[PDB]
Design a protein around this ligand. Sequence first.
Ligand SMILES: Cc1cc2nc3c(=O)[nH]c(=O)nc-3n(C[C@H](O)[C@H](O)[C@H](O)COP(=O)(O)OP(=O)(O)OC[C@H]3O[C@@H](n4cnc5c(N)ncnc54)[C@H](O)[C@@H]3O)c2cc1C
Length: 270
Amino acid sequence: PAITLESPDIKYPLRLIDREIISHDTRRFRFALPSPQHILGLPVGQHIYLSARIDGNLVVRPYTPISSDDDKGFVDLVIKVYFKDTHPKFPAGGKMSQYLESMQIGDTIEFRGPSGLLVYQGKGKFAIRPDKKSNPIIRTVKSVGMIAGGTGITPMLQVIRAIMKDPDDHTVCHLLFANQTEKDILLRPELEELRNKHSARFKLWYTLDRAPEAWDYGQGFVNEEMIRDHLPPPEEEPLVLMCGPPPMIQYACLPNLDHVGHPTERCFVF
Ligand SMILES: Cc1cc2nc3c(=O)[nH]c(=O)nc-3n(C[C@H](O)[C@H](O)[C@H](O)COP(=O)(O)OP(=O)(O)OC[C@H]3O[C@@H](n4cnc5c(N)ncnc54)[C@H](O)[C@@H]3O)c2cc1C
């Protein structure tokens, strides 16, 4: 159809048309593409760049839509709002996130894309560029390991959806979704729906820093056992995809990946 993100260098103002309070911090923000038949123009695996001049300082932060290029007229972004005066070190909270919460209906925010090193080309085929200028290295995988932390499910979900939507895409997605509390399990219905509908291909497990009284899943930070039991066996040569808070990736993921047997080259951070 009509691509909204025609140029990666042009910022495209889109209007906010709906907001869904996914959780206390994270909200699903729907934006209106230029035409009701216009598409976003986002290859699976890539992300967009929201740009706005907040506090006199142009702040450009990146977000991965939960919408699919199949969806027309709208762009759904599950964005967590780091609230002000809710963190001891950060009384100013998030910058773009708080602007987005403040955004009323019909306010405009600029979009830029596509941007990203990973593109899913279908049926195991992941085009991962080592650098933005270097050419993408293409590797077909039978399983995809995925470690998502909080708002880092949106890049995973994009991939999960694409694979499950193609019945000839036999790649098997293993997801490890790490959040602080049960209330913080974003897109949990969608995810559980995906698993029920495509169990053979989608394997789902959660970990919560502070779990509820009844947690049939896992507790604590990301650990080696959960990477071992709830991600693909390293022998299957899978692709471990990771999005989470930089600390979580550095201290909980990358270390415990080595322990299980996953190589750095078979692993990618969104
Ligand atoms: C590929 C990709 C996709 C992404 N997709 C999404 C997405 O879909 N949705 C999304 O929300 N984010 C997404 N992010 C992350 C996003 O860019 C930000 O991390 C954040 O959501 C908004 O930025 P900000 O300007 O609000 O943060 P900043 O203001 O730049 O954050 C500054 C620091 O303050 C901390 N901080 C501030 N207040 C608090 C608080 N109350 N509690 C804890 N820490 C606090 C932050 O954690 C951070 O360390 C994505 C990132 C990447 C790389």
